[PDB]
Paper text:
The Delta and Kappa variants of [name]-[name]-2 co-emerged in India in late 2020, with the Delta variant underlying the resurgence of COVID-19, even in countries with high vaccination rates. Herein, we report cryo-electron microscopy (cryo-EM) structures of Delta and Kappa variant S protein trimers – both in the unbound state and in complex with the [name] receptor – to gain insight into how their mutations underlie changes in [name] binding and antibody neutralisation escape. Within the receptor-binding domain ([name]) of the S protein, both the Kappa and Delta variants share an identical substitutional mutation (L452R) with the previously emerged variants of interest B.1.427/429 (Epsilon). Finally, the P681R mutation (present in all B.1.617 lineages) immediately precedes the furin cleavage consensus sequence (682-RRSR/SVA-688), with initial reports suggesting that the P681R mutation enhances cleavage, and consequently S protein post-fusion transition.
As for the Kappa variant, the Delta variant S protein–[name] complex focus-refined cryo-EM structure also reveals limited sidechain rearrangement at the [name]-[name] interface. The Delta variant lacks the E484Q substitution which preserves the E484–K31 electrostatic interaction, while the common L452R mutation may increase [name] binding by enhancing electrostatic complementarity. Further, the Delta variant lysine substitution at position 478 (T478K) extends its positively charged sidechain towards an electronegative region on [name] (centred at position E87). Analysis of the electrostatic surface potential of the [name]-bound Delta variant S protein is consistent with enhancements in electrostatic complementarity afforded by both the L452R and T478K mutations.
Author numbering:
A (entry chain E): 19 to 614
B (entry chain B): 330 to 530
């Protein structure tokens, strides 16, 4: 009869015939990932083509139901998700050109091999040939050579391709009733129709600038401290008044500063909290690592893993004969099938990764009651944030003492807390200006604020202004320096890391307040607290049914993303850095004072 | 007295194939001796929920006829086989009366009814114009009309085929794994009751 009943029956018909197809596609993808063989690639491609064709046919059928005559929020959300054209609105010639451009960028990034001129007989790929050199070398000219050579080859190949890519994506976005591709990416956080909890696409940029303005003093003090330590490491290259050289940040692009912990350690004399040797001595298998993670999740009140998880997951490297992707990934295959694909070693990093991926599995399990097209996170930030909170809680010394991995007579003084907080800042705080600058640059490129002939002159100007990182030598417009990174070259949103970082500490403050922790925020553990698990599970069970603003109200009691929990987390480090920066100069100059 | 001619519970529980939930099999059991303790003492059943009678006194009471309804549903849909429930199975596939006397026995059948490619032989009625009456069987395969437009026989837009297949894989979760359900319905009618329990000596 009515349009709403028709849409509800159509959505039931969709969820039923779409869960099985998604399960077939996901199972084929799993069979490819655990067994890299050409027939498995063909089966994956066939399943993906069937899934995509089915989604195209259902979207074509779905558009015939007008949105304004439906009042139920869940039905409207599923219909909005299904009715998006995507690339279908673009012409077939341009769509094929766009797909070809995406595939060739994927091949250029994945199979890009660069080595030194005059010695071309063998060359090194980015992983792991160049990663180890960027993360471990202490030589100025070697890192400069690797950085400049990789940006020369990759940027000169990718610059016309990116110029075509921006135009095609803008054409698709304006054809899809968006201002630009940046508006399309910002539409993930768009909430419409809920009174008070509405969020606009234009509000995201303003909120990001407002939060970053409060991030900036902590980052400036951290930058000054890192500058002083790198000045100690490299005597003449780094200037006291200028920016950091780009090739000295410990990674290829500057995404993380976690490779500078050895150079920038506050108290080298004091021990670390490494628990690897303790697991090696007690013969901790990967199965024990996942069982301890399961014990952590049952301690907080969440459901334990299914029998199918233990039977069907690959938690150890299979062997020489069978090839598998080594990257840790949590798979929600559909129909209640949850698996973890991780090549788990006996390390602290793998243990924390196991907690992170099992957090992803818990998040996926929680919204299994929801309809199929609403089985996702409320935004792109929450899904990663719920794993990062488990990574935060598991890494605490109280958790390590509780599970027996750390000695009960281990002395927790202020110095160990300072160096641990500095490592967490280099991993977490250091990525925030780079992420914000990269997303703002891409948004201005998509919006047309930056013409194609002025992309790099603005970009380095942005990097000096925001990140405080200077180019080693000037680059002209023949270079394509942003696209050397994995996420930008393969059409991925990058603001998820910024939102994830803020949501991580907001959730951590909310759960620690729920768990009645009475000390510093970084010393808080959410184990043994049923109420904290209940508060988390209230948001976890919703999935994408409710707005992310309402979910954030459910957890932290705020209607907007907030920056204060992060600053509260790093407050001991902030006081220590302010004390240590009396002689040195906080802040940087955008001029070419160190080197150009 | 020495008792023989036991009731055929082997042909219901240990059947090689079970029916679909839309076309659930009904077997009338009469004029024999029904030993219910073999079923109750089995550890092979996941659900043994009895409504209106207790399992302990089943072996003493006598009934006129026993109706054994057999079908296959999902793990998450076993809860809907109860009086007063709402769902796809209760409204459109198998409806139980509120005044029901009998037992609902369900067990996991992932070993037999799931294959690696997918077992699609089990179908369920997804749409019907009106809810089913208790103990009604609908085997009609007429196109469901969700919109005023005349369907005209073809499955196009707003007109759907009511019987949708089920997908059974051995790696599925416990809420999606196939569960064989046998519902025993006990009624007492004015005729002399012939399905009596065994008499202990
Ligand atoms: C992986 O593929 C090979 C190819 O023949 C096959 O023999 C083997 O059984 C497969 N292993 C798994 C775990 O799927
Ligand atoms: C929206 O539809 C779902 C099922 O499709 C229903 O359970 C829910 O109550 C509806 N919400 C409102 C506000 O009517
Ligand atoms: C998708 O594209 C079709 C054809 O170009 C158009 O009719 C439809 O309105 C588009 N969808 C939306 C949500 O605008
Ligand atoms: C998961 O929890 C349930 C109840 O808490 C328990 O019966 C079951 O044995 C647990 N699973 C495992 C593998 O321990
Ligand atoms: C650590 O605590 C001791 C004891 O009060 C104090 O003397 C020292 O300055 C503190 N150091 C830091 C870095 O907080
Ligand atoms: C949490 O519960 C377990 C189970 O008894 C216990 O061994 C552990 O010590 C508890 N955690 C803390 C911090 O007391
Ligand atoms: C049915 O099968 C089970 C398991 O194979 C067997 O133990 C039982 O005796 C059979 N018969 C009945 C009436 O349950």
């Amino acid at each position: 009869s009515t349009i709403e009943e028709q849409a509800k029956t159509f959505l039931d018909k969709f969820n039923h015939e779409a869960e099985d197809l998604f399960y077939q596609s996901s199972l084929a993808s799993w069979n490819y990932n655990t067994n890299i063989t050409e027939e498995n690639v063909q089966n994956m491609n066939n399943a993906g083509d069937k899934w995509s064709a089915f989604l195209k046919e259902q979207s074509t059928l779905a558009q015939m139901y007008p949105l304004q005559e439906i009042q139920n929020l869940t039905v409207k959300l599923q219909l909005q998700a299904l009715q998006q054209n995507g690339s279908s609105v673009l012409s077939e010639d341009k769509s094929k050109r766009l797909n070809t451009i995406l595939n060739t960028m994927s091949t250029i990034y994945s199979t890009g091999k660069v080595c030194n001129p005059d010695n071309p007989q063998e060359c090194l790929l980015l992983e792991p040939g160049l990663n180890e050199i960027m993360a471990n070398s202490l030589d100025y000219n070697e890192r400069l050579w690797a950085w400049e050579s990789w940006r020369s080859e990759v940027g000169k190949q990718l610059r016309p391709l990116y110029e075509e890519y921006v135009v095609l994506k803008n054409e698709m976005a304006r054809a899809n009733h968006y201002e630009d591709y940046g508006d399309y990416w910002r539409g993930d956080y768009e909430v419409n129709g809920v009174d008070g909890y509405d969020y606009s696409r234009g509000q995201l940029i303003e909120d990001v600038e407002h939060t970053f303005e409060e991030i900036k003093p902590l980052y400036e003090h951290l930058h000054a401290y890192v500058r002083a330590k790198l000045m100690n490491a490299y005597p003449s290259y780094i200037s006291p008044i200028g920016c950091l050289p780009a090739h000295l940040l410990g990674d290829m692009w500057g995404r993380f500063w976690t490779n500078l912990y050895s150079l920038t350690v506050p108290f080298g004399q004091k021990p670390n909290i490494d628990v690897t040797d303790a697991m090696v001595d007690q013969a901790w298998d990967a199965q024990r690592i996942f069982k301890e993670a399961e014990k952590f999740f049952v301690s907080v009140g969440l459901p334990n893993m299914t029998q199918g998880f233990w039977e069907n997951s690959m938690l150890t490297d299979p062997g020489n004969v069978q090839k598998a992707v080594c990257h840790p990934t949590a798979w929600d295959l559909g129909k209640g099938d949850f698996r973890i694909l991780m090549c788990t070693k006996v390390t602290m990093d793998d243990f924390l990764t196991a907690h992170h991926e099992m957090g992803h599995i818990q998040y996926d399990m929680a919204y299994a009651a929801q309809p199929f097209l609403l089985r996702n996170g409320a935004n792109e930030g929450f899904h990663e944030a719920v794993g990062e909170i488990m990574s935060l809680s598991a890494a605490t010394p109280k958790h390590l003492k509780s599970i027996g991995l750390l000695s009960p007579d281990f002395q927790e003084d202020n110095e160990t807390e300072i160096n641990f907080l500095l490592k967490q800042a280099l991993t977490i705080v250091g990525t925030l200006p780079f992420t914000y600058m990269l997303e703002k640059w891409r948004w201005m490129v998509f919006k047309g604020e930056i013409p194609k002939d002025q992309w790099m002159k603005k970009w380095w100007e942005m990097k000096r202004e925001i990140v405080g990182v200077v180019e080693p030598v000037p680059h002209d417009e023949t270079y394509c320096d942003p696209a050397s990174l994995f996420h930008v070259s393969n059409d991925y949103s990058f603001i998820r890391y910024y939102t994830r970082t803020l949501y991580q500490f907001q959730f951590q403050e909310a759960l620690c307040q729920a768990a009645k922790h009475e000390g510093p925020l970084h010393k808080c553990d959410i184990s043994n607290s049923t109420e904290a698990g209940q508060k988390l599970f209230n948001m976890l069970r919703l999935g994408k049914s409710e707005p992310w603003t309402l979910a954030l109200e459910n957890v932290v009691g705020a209607k907007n993303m907030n920056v204060r929990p992060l600053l509260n987390y790093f407050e001991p480090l902030f006081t220590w850095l302010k004390d240590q920066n009396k002689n040195s100069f906080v802040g940087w100059s955008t001029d070419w004072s160190p080197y150009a | 007295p020495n008792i023989t001619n036991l009731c055929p519970f082997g042909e219901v529980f240990n059947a090689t194939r079970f029916a679909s939930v839309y076309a659930w099999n009904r077997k009338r059991i009469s004029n024999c001796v029904a030993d219910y303790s073999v079923l109750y003492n089995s550890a092979s059943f996941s659900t043994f929920k009895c409504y209106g009678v207790s399992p302990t006194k089943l072996n003493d009471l006598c009934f006129t006829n026993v109706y054994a309804d057999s079908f296959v549903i999902r793990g998450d849909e076993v809860r809907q086989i109860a009086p007063g429930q709402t769902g796809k199975i209760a409204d459109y596939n198998y409806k139980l009366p509120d005044d029901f006397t009998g037992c609902v026995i369900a067990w996991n059948s992932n070993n037999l009814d799931s294959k690696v490619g997918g077992n699609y032989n089990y179908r369920y009625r997804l749409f019907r114009k009106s809810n089913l009456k208790p103990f009604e069987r609908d085997i009609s395969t007429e196109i469901y009309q969700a919109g005023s437009k005349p369907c005209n026989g073809v499955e196009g837009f707003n007109c759907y085929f009511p019987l949708q297949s089920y997908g059974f894989q051995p790696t599925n979760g416990v809420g999606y794994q196939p569960y064989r359900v046998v519902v025993l319905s006990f009624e007492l009618l004015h005729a002399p009751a012939t399905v009596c329990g065994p008499k202990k000596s």
